[model samples]
Target chain A: KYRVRKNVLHLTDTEKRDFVRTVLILKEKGIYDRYIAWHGAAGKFHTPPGSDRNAAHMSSAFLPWHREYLLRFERDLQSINPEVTLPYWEWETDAQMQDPSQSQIWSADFMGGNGNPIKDFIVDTGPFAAGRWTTIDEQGNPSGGLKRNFGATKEAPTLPTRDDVLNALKITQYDTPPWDMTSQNSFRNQLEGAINGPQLHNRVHRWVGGQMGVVPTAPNDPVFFLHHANVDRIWAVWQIIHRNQNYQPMKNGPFGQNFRDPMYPWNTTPEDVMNHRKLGYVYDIEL
Target chain B: KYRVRKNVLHLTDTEKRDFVRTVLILKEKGIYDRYIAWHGAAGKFHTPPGSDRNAAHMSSAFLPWHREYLLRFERDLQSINPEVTLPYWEWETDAQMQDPSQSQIWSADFMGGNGNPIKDFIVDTGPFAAGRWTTIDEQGNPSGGLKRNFGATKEAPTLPTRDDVLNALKITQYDTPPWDMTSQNSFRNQLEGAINGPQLHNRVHRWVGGQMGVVPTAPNDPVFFLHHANVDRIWAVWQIIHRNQNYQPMKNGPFGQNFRDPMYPWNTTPEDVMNHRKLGYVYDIE
Candidate 1:
């Protein structure tokens, strides 16, 4: 049986309810506990305490890191539920400003509404007062206005549609000239916040019921996979569009100017990333 | 300091001597022994008797296997001589019509002449016989008649030049109609026989040093690196010119009409080979 069917956009109301119900059953059964344990805590916005910050970064947010995470989830989910293959929602497709509330994947409960049960914010849990949340300006340059709201705000943040998130994933545009390898931190900062930052943080909290507090919790959340599945799906889609262009151009590109920086954990360089066949494995184009 | 000077057409007489001498020293100092011991023996062509063919093929020949071997060799060599970085020989540049006798990398013992300890037949360890060789034929089917001595009587083989190998590597001409993936096997068979086969097999025996037909003796031979280095270099060169073209067309490629066969180890599917960056790691173009 095929794990995923084509045209998820065609799923009727009943089909959506069944799909959500099945997701809930799987989460309650703890079939995805191991995955959540590993990646849930390591997500860029959700590193556990007492871990090396760099190690956490390496395991989370970066393209390479999350790619591996989503792959495992896909493989496992497919194995468990053969007829329910992961489906990706292309966020950019909705940029024409369609009704955000129409998508089957997005609901107020799934998205979060005013007086949401998940909103008991401890001081450092949510992105508000957490040491990690540095507010940024329109250009994604960090502005020094970090604040937290515990029971102070009137309405909870509105949840974004799958299409809204996908739109963010489609962003390849960057203000910094490409391949500026000089300042590794600056380059990474710009890439994370501008290219992939907002959507990554917002989607999880908005859709999965994550909160900002010492005991902040969404560990039992079923919406986590739907959100991450879309993230991984976007990456898979990107790989399809941009193949074999791994290395950064000399003066400008996504690749760093310096060739020596190991592409993290693997100890490989930019030159290594240029050719994917040299390593093994390829992605499936269609979700 | 640079381990290798740039733009040198051929290894100088002194460079050749230094290279061979370095290999000999590595052999004498038991560096190769440690390497073979650390990473199991070479499979496919050099597979030990009684090993599972599938296991051997899967475990040997690709990244995980070669990475370990190279890492150990690089480490051992550095410990003994810190100034030396592994000097890689670009062999794809010479795959077509090479003269093994003239190679700065090949020593007098590896050449085909009087007083050479081993015969020329012993030089190249039959790569085609093991089915590791890739070639095509006139009908465009992927075929390799690389059976042992398949064409021994026709004409004695000779090594290819850098240009010859480069030409062979540039099989992109086959991309169009009458695009024969199998037609090239005949060319590859002959090329392998001519270029480094005889010399390489001979060096294997020389490195093992009269230990053949004994207890699956480890050929902790320094020549192993040199031989594989040449193979790796060939792959690198082939990748450069080919860029991102799938080795064969999508459906009718050498991998077969159905793409998900585990037998095709290159990637998840024959089509997957189209993009290397999606997989990870790139080749050095130069």
Candidate 2:
């Protein structure tokens, strides 16, 4: 009930500034690098070693694992600044703009402009500009600075529309047997954007490009949390609409994907985090 | 201590069989893969993102980190079979052999024979043969099988001798300034094999080729734990010799390398795991 996460647009300038400052403090403290390493670790941690069902993605635990990840990250942020909470980047609304790149979220005071063409796709604007904010490669070695190439990929040239989210919410089952990227009519899969080929959550990642376009390195970008916060908000909304639906593969599923099984890199289970309200937070619209 | 880690050379056939069986069971239950992944994760997790100091290696935390790792792994083994505990392969003694590859530890019934030349250095014999035990690549995908080419690397043609172990033990300081691979007179770096170019610990890694040769994918082979168990034993011996000495950079050091700072990939610190006796385990010789 407490800690209402607001949309990025709803954030006052001071809220944005505080959030940015808090994240910078975390980076300076060397804590932000841990989250990056943790995410990369979980992605490579196959649930059964050879299977595509990793602890964090391409499986039923994707939603719950990310939920726990964001919860921990938000808790860390609150430790630095009690007033700041993770804000969602509502790309669905941004899709309605004439030039989504012109969205206020990309202003010089905020996330800054896209990658500079002459500078090898390196982001040269905003707080995380190259040289100002250091980045690491897949090997965890220091890789110069942050980069972004918005809507550059042919597969995902635009943000997902509100209708896409609406259609995904219509799915009733939380997940199905063989609960992975191949699951059908699975709200988990649908929302993960793996059903119809990178629709919602995956679409936003592709649209952002750079580190966001990849799996292991996605969390390197600060917007990763904001992007996931929106995805989480949508899942919370779906939970409300499909009140009768419960987490599937309640038993007899893969080891880490089971409802009560502990997620990799951490012990939190889907059953432990099934309720967003119980996790002590709600979206702004919930008010 | 109640839990005594024994040398592989001294283990009875039944103890060896039980240890192997418990490990296989851990692998079957998908728990073994977590250890492999965790090791790989820690290697890539540089202490400060750019420094050579990782959570598990090339730093002051290397000794404590692996100690905690083996502790957790031994605990998991105990979960499967209470009689089972991690055993060390004392390669220093084995190095005395005219042909070190002929050591009993390489027997099919034990750690298994060397990799086959005809089949791309993949281990064809032993409980963890290529067909029986699967392996993962650096990317975590199935890499088909376990492989080893012992003593093949030019840089490490032989295992460190017992003299090498004794020499490392003579170092009084646990670790020195910089607290990294370049640290001078530091027992951690000495045992870690960065002192005079991969002398002790690093030589053994190179001596056992295949998956054991690399950092990220080394844990795919079962002997990684055995190798680390011996390293831990050596460190424990060092601790016994220097009762008055302590972990270095207690105050003005890197974040994760500090005495009380939590080692990456886990919360256990150097201070938390500094005393092996306090951790409820002791080497057989101790």
Candidate 3:
């Protein structure tokens, strides 16, 4: 029951194959689309009419909210294979190279490369490229293949460096008041790239761009889990660093969006997510 | 060639009335529905099949792309009244204190409030609520007035804050790549709320729930422009800081998604979007 999550970089070739095969199996079984639709719905229903942005607790409850969101997804993904654990994409490491387009993960054997420039941002190459896969979009429309633009430019920039990561981790508080985008000094803001400016979490989404960048349809990209895994790992690191001093509003009163608020579906709260071990998992590497 | 945009909060009573009247006038004139269709179409085409994320450059060209989208909409709105400019909700400031539904703006005189709880996501509250107005959903399905939960079934929270806006302005880079969602430190990611851990741009969409939250149909709410006006205002904020620092991919070659890439129909490039004055307008407040 206690399965430690592994990094995508360290995964053996066979492990990678298993990961791809299982995802393909899920696609074949019609489960992958279900999650994509849920994400689509997740982004949609939260924002009522006349509203401008996503209602999902972005600034404050962001970490916990996504923790729940990604957990639900991981659970569903796990149902396919107990041995399969979601992997993390060490973003800065991936983008640290000269040509991010040449990142190892985008090989035809792995997640794929950018779409043809002339053909728009459609992913024409890689294991999950257009023809290799068929899936449903956030709109519930069934379709074929995946799309990406990894390091679309000849030399995409690098992700956040260790300095930024350390800076984000150095913060002890989980979140501050009026918690939306304005929140500062809060660790949530730092990790979310709001405080010391856009840093870690935000950069990963744009690192792989394409399918991953779009909100409602983002989870549609398989890389979502890997990216999130890394995010979750950072949280794990934050948790260890902050430990007892960590946590949020705890009560749902002031910030309006509460820390102990019930995350539906799994119906858990931030308390449930504060520890990875509680979820029956640990990281392969210590922070 | 240079028009000044005003903060809705700072505007005189006459301006607020004019803003609403102009928006409503767009509704009666068919211009409102036309843009909603475009947003709906924008979400669909960029995300062909299963890619639900923003193909509309939610990650990269977010600032400029929407800058153009809002400008065009404003142009149409402006035609209604050369004196009326788009209004912005400074979010946190606008939604602070009360349960978002109870904000002063929801007096039935202004925008509106939440939906019927025991009921559906349907809005029974505002001027745009059930009976007050009616419009087509994003899917081309003609429907009633509008839908919003303001704060959802429970006491849902409201928009971003002053700190949020201030935080966004701190970022210097226009965008990094793959410029989609993964671009870290990219101003586009932070503003779009795509890259930042969990954040804004998309926050308002969820805040209003129903129509606006639902991407393609986002523009259906009419208030979408107002919300976007706030987002656009922030871009103006970024422009001031970056100035010459602001520029797009300029070429679409390797990144696949280019800066100068045509935004279609408008046939405009990110370059065109960089300067709002070039589009003939500016924000109301500083």
Candidate 4:
């Protein structure tokens, strides 16, 4: 029962359909929505550990916490369609594009193209286009439409390059103190694009520059999964290099909490996540 | 009158003494409590936007907010002694060291050294050493003590290189939302050490583990201001290259309420900080 998640670029048509079908199913489940771009209401805000694990989760816990969350999302997707596994959209393929909007991943057959700028980057094109489905932001209900811009580079000149990935691999430690967003020489920080490794994870958000640009609701667009899938794959690749001892805060303290420390709702710890084999999957890549 | 902030290494012995006097004075006051070596008493746990505009202050707000705070600290210090200015500790010199602890900044007369691990990384030595002055952590009262260890390389590495500074300067825009820590290539994010560009600001915190390492109360160690002064200087150097367009979030939206938007408690905005001249001071180096 080992689940092999494939690269979105390499998927067969049937496999692609199953993946899409599962995502569509999860969209309707309120139970699934909290992690998928949460909301604030009841005339209130839930500060201190606010917005998922966001404010506190930036450093140290970055990798394992997300790994824990992603694993759950994968399982739920599998629940809907046993044949489907999470597929990664390697944004690098589009990064080299002369006009990234023209990339095939944005085709009507896929997630869809750039949204209408006149309509607030609203989708009038993809499966989630024409306000066909909604994403939650500050809105109280499912009224806001799915929106995206494949490449609106008023700011971006390029995405995290091949060398950036290579340089990131050289950072040996798991994480250091002042853990959130400031941890240096930290693999998790670099992968998350918090430190200046290659901009591997964060640059893509700016490159997309619409719904994807908003950190809180970036997941509102389904492409969020594919993007993070590639992010997890990048870490998987990093793990291949440094295999002796993996993970930060292997014992205790902030980032490397005692592997037994629960990842909240999942009831798992950084300990459980360190053994990817226990999680029942390994990357298609060498390591 | 304009107050010139100098690098710590450049300070004369008298200037350094005066600076220490002001810091010790402020420690007795409540001002120092807000920033340094913090911990919680319900059991140790830290949260957001503690230092350098932290989580809440990202993208456009980070640079300006810290800039605002550093200026106020400078003014407060000057009030204690007019000739004294904020002196920055150029952590790079230590970064090049084979063993960063071997460097002079961690010495008895200066800010001080690592904590006694046997005593939870507590410093029993320096001016800010344990028992000499109390530090706060998770509790509401002062239950923690100042701590530090340089080049504790089990996880530490050299801070950003000169080239890291060069690369950071090349980033043209100030910020783009969702702003915060994830903003890429924004000069604000780079300097904050969020997207890496040398990690000029964050690396030192990790290098000086114990007290300086913790974000909320890292400032508890007097070195925090010097460290931030160096960080503020890095931003200053960047501005020299693009003299025409000074600070960030140039207009409004996403990063602020408006260009005139106040930087939370400071009652200032990105607009207020764009010109260092208006702040009534300049750095000695560039």
Q: By lDDT, who's the top model here?
A: 2
lDDT of 4 by residue, B11-91 (tens): 766666677778888666434543331111100110111212221234466666667778777776776777878777777
* Tens-place lDDT digits, model 2, residues B1-286: 9899999999898998898899999988778888888898889988787888888889898999999999999999998998898999999999999999998788878889899999999899999998899999988888889899988888999999999999999998999988899899999999999988778988999889999998888999999999999999999999989999998779777778889877877767899998888998989987
lDDT of 3 by residue, B1-286 (tens): 4567765556665676667777777665444654665455445433223433343646455566678788777777777778776777667676666555565555555676666765676777655777756667654456775777665523224576778778888987877755667677877778888654336777778777887777777777767777888888888778887778856566632221356654432346677667777788777656
Residue A185 in model 1: shift from native, Å? 13
- Backbone clash total for model 3 is 57
TM-score of the B chain in each candidate versus the native B chain = 0.43, 0.98, 0.87, 0.84
lDDT of the structure predicted as candidate 4:
0.62
Per-candidate total of colliding backbone pairs: 52, 0, 57, 24
Judging by lDDT, tell me the better candidate of 2 and 4.
2
**DockQ, structure candidate 4:** 0.01
Q: Tens digits of per-residue lDDT for model 2 on A86-179?
A: 9999999999998899998887677777999898789999989987789888888888878799999999999999999899988989998788
Q: Candidate 1 on B64-172: residue-level lDDT in tens?
A: 2343345445555656665444555443343342443343344443211112233322323322211332222221123332111211222224323555555557555
Can you tell me the DockQ of model 2? 0.62
Quantify all predictions' global Cα lDDT against the true fold: 0.34, 0.89, 0.65, 0.62
Total clashing pairs in model 2: 0
Off by over 4 Å in 1: A1-8, A12-18, A40-61, A89-102, A107-219, A247-287, B1-286
Report how far off residue B121 is in candidate 3 (Å). 19
Indicate which candidate wins on TM-score.
2
What TM-score between 0 and 1 does chain B of candidate 1 receive?
Answer: 0.43
